[PDB]
Design a binder for this molecule. Structure first.
Ligand SMILES: NCCCC(=O)Nc1ccc(OCc2ccccc2)cc1
Ligand SMILES: [Yb+3]
Ligand SMILES: [Zn+2]
Length: 610
């Protein structure tokens, strides 16, 4: 009707709108707090606007300055993962389009769900601490007060004081560094973002950061120790950027920097404008996990330019991005590779539907997050059910060239806007008006609103998948007399991508007999492989098949890195295996204070502790 964001307690975009944020703050590593001022330019959309509501979580409100003086504010009671509402009394009754600056001084709790503060022990260099944010989905409200909904877009400017030996970086173009006036011993790093973004894309890192040039508009940022390994790993970036512009239109953000974060960073990447954050688990040393870079580049259009209006429509962000990602890798390595990766995607979707259950609400494409913590709903479903829909539609409407024309125009039309599934679908019909009859063969109700597997499977080239299936199946159906025929030559012609897919297929049918999984380690030596995607699935397969020797390997992987994609299922498998159950829980209890806060709360929920 007139859409409301159910994950926000803030006044909606239909009442007022944040157009800009000015951010002055200092990063205190001893108190583990961000202190400062957050000045919001807000614009009324109705007449007689006498007060507005902002989202907060564990925020200490020092003062709220409007037009020079101090004003009357009022924090409501805590509302769970959502935090507490901050209703602000305005001294002037605002009328249509009239703007106002609400300057709000503030401190962040040390247990901010947006932030992980690391000690020197937890870093590579061992001598300096570190900070990083991760605002998506609704954690920006835990760094500063805001309409913490992606239905609102705002430019922002920032100045941030940090210990003089550490570097700050933000999701913005760097606007110079200068010694701090108020107290030496600290620099003040300055930042500006002229493209209006949703607040989930505001982002901050602070640490012993060096850089390295790997393309005309790209430096990799990490700690001394990883900088070199990473320059090698993400060399393909500029070439990916070029393809992405041919598919998406002009890359408008100015810079595309990459930041390789500490092992505890909870996702494969986060698409922070001008500075993409990635897991060091990408550092396989052969560029084989560069699809993740492809994916983050693509968010510079689908996500960051065209944005889900609410998190219910999150598939728009991820479905499109995965579609662009797979085009990028297709251009670089061939159409048969794009189909290989698309089919694996369907396989991940099958695992998601089986894990949640086929009638589960989070297997729907468009969801309802009323009273659900977004972090708990998060999964592969919006990624792979979304991709599957786009892929099916590509095939139905006359193929990738024709569908990529829809894509670029879709991006062009909704650029700098926040939109829903209906905006997307209404534009699909508009663009493809000469094929409306074809569009009406789509079971829109099933695809969009029904749980489980999609009602139709797309068509996939098999070239590269067949070798994975033959071998997965040989193992799944092996008896005693087959075990001596397996041999390291079985892998002679398989890429790392195919080893991974082979293990993914085998894992779908776990458990295998213990003797079989031992034999697999003997002929193939998967223990020696450091590729995190491969090691992950191999250790799942081992634990789920009751192999005790895999226990210390799986505990090591689950705690020495904390990308949730790997950490969560390794903990869960370890907990379901009777031999490792107690050690899994104890390991969790002993690590949970030095863990990222969203990851710690999720692993705790998975392990049914507290
Ligand atoms: N996009 C970069 C990776 C981080 C990320 O996407 N985080 C994130 C996204 C959505 C979310 O919650 C909303 C949701 C979950 C599942 C389905 C639909 C919406 C929570 C975290
Ligand atoms: Yb046999
Ligand atoms: Zn994404």
């Amino acid at each position: 009707p007139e859409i409301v964001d159910t994950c926000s307690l803030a006044s909606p975009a239909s009442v007022c709108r944040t157009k800009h944020l000015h951010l002055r703050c200092s990063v205190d590593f001893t108190r583990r707090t961000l202190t400062g001022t957050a000045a919001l330019t807000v614009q009324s959309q109705e007449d007689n606007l006498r007060s507005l509501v902002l989202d907060t979580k564990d925020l200490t409100i020092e003062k709220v300055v409007i037009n020079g003086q101090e004003v009357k504010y009022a924090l409501g009671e805590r509302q769970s993962y959502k935090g507490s509402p901050m209703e602000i009394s305005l001294p002037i009754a605002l009328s249509k389009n009239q703007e106002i600056v609400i300057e709000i001084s503030f401190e962040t709790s040390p247990k901010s769900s947006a932030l992980q503060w690391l000690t020197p022990e937890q870093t590579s260099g061992k001598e300096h601490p570190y900070l990083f944010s991760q605002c998506q989905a609704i954690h920006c409200r835990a760094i500063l007060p805001c309409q913490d909904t992606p239905s609102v877009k705002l430019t922002y400017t920032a100045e941030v004081s940090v210990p003089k030996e550490l570097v700050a970086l933000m999701s913005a173009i760097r606007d110079g560094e200068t010694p701090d006036p108020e107290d030496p011993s600290r620099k003040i790093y300055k930042f500006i973002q002229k493209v209006p973004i949703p607040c989930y894309l505001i982002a901050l890192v602070v640490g012993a950061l060096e850089s390295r040039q790997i393309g005309p508009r790209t430096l990799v940022w990490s700690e001394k120790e990883q900088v070199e390994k990473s320059a090698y790993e993400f060399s393909e970036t500029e070439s990916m950027l070029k393809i992405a512009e041919d598919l998406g239109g002009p890359y408008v953000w100015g810079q595309y920097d990459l930041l390789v974060l500490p092992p505890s960073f909870p996702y494969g990447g986060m698409e922070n404008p001008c500075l993409t954050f990635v897991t060091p688990t990408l550092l396989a040393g052969d560029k084989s996990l560069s699809n993740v870079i492809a994916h983050e580049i693509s968010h510079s259009w689908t996500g960051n330019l065209v944005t889900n209006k609410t998190w219910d429509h999150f598939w728009l962000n991820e479905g499109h991005t995965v579609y662009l990602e797979r085009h990028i890798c297709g251009r670089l390595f061939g159409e048969k590779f794009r189909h290989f990766n698309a089919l694996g995607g369907w396989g991940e979707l099958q695992n998601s539907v089986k894990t949640f259950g086929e009638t589960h609400p989070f297997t729907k494409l468009v969801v309802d997050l009323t009273d659900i913590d977004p972090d708990v709903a998060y999964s592969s479903v919006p990624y792979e059910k979304g991709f599957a829909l786009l892929f099916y539609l590509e095939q139905l409407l006359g193929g990738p060239e024709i569908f990529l024309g829809f894509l670029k125009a879709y991006v062009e039309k909704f650029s700098y806007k926040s939109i829903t599934t209906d905006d997307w679908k209404d534009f699909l019909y508009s663009y493809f008006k000469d094929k409306v009859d074809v569009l009406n063969q789509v079971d829109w109700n099933a695809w969009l609103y029904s749980p489980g597997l999609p009602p139709i499977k797309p068509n996939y080239d098999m070239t590269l998948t067949n070798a994975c299936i033959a071998l997965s199946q040989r193992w799944i159906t092996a008896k005693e007399d087959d075990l001596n025929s397996f041999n390291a030559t079985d892998l002679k012609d398989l890429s790392s991508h195919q080893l991974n897919e082979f293990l993914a297929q085998t894992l779908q049918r776990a458990p295998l007999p213990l003797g079989h999984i031992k034999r697999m380690q003997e002929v193939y030596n998967f223990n020696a492989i450091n590729n995190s995607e491969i090691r992950f699935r191999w250790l799942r397969l081992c634990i789920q098949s009751k192999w005790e020797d895999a226990i210390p390997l799986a505990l090591k992987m689950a705690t020495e890195q904390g990308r949730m994609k790997f950490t969560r299922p390794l903990f869960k498998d370890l907990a379901a295996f009777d031999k490792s159950h107690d050690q899994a829980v104890r390991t969790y209890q002993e690590h949970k204070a030095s863990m990222h806060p969203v990851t710690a709360m999720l692993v705790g929920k998975d392990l049914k502790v507290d």
